[PDB]
Amino acid sequence: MAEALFKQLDANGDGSVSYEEVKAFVSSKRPIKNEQLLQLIFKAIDIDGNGEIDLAEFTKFAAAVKEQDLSDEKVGLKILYKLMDADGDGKLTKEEVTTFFKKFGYEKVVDQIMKADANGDGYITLEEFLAFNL
């Protein structure tokens, strides 16, 4: 008398879908509040050309982050992104990033960076950067 598999939840058997549905499905179990922040991050963590992810993508990603020889490498530039961020205070402004990312070795990114943001921030936060290379 128990269950734990998005399989049914989905049923569609399409494998992929809008985690949003899984975010709520789970949110109505152990958690309660987070489906938002998550769903959000996820939605952005996707943008692979739709917005519908697959339990696999999530799981794989988890097993991908689990590995102790990949993230760390980035963690470094990350910890630096947060530290170096003395003016940003959390978000790195074009100039900031451009210079930072460039000082780090992402001059060719400056292009995607400037073309990355353009909604209502004009800057790039830790995530953002990590988003470009997630």
Residues that bind Ca ion (CB under 5 A): 46, 48, 53, 117, 121
Residue 123: enclosing H or E segment and its boundaries? strand 123-125
> How is residue 88 written in tokens?
């940003």
Please say which residue, 48 or 95, places its beta carbon nearer to Ca ion.
48
* CB 123 to Ca ion: min, Å: 6
> How is residue 134 written in tokens?
């997630």
Please say which residue, 1 or 90, places its beta carbon nearer to Ca ion.
90
- Say how far apart CA 65 and CA 80 lie, in whole Å: 19
Nearest residue to Ca ion, scored by beta-carbon proximity: 121
> How is residue 67 written in tokens?
């590995």
* CB 84 to Ca ion: min, Å: 18
* CB 15 to Ca ion: min, Å: 10
Please say which residue, 68 or 119, places its beta carbon nearer to Ca ion.
119
Residues facing residue 73 across a β-bridge: none
* CB 44 to Ca ion: min, Å: 10
Q: What is the DSSP letter of 33?
A: S
Please say which residue, 49 or 105, places its beta carbon nearer to Ca ion.
49
- Say how far apart CA 51 and CA 17 lie, in whole Å: 8
Contact 114, 122 (CB under 8 A): no
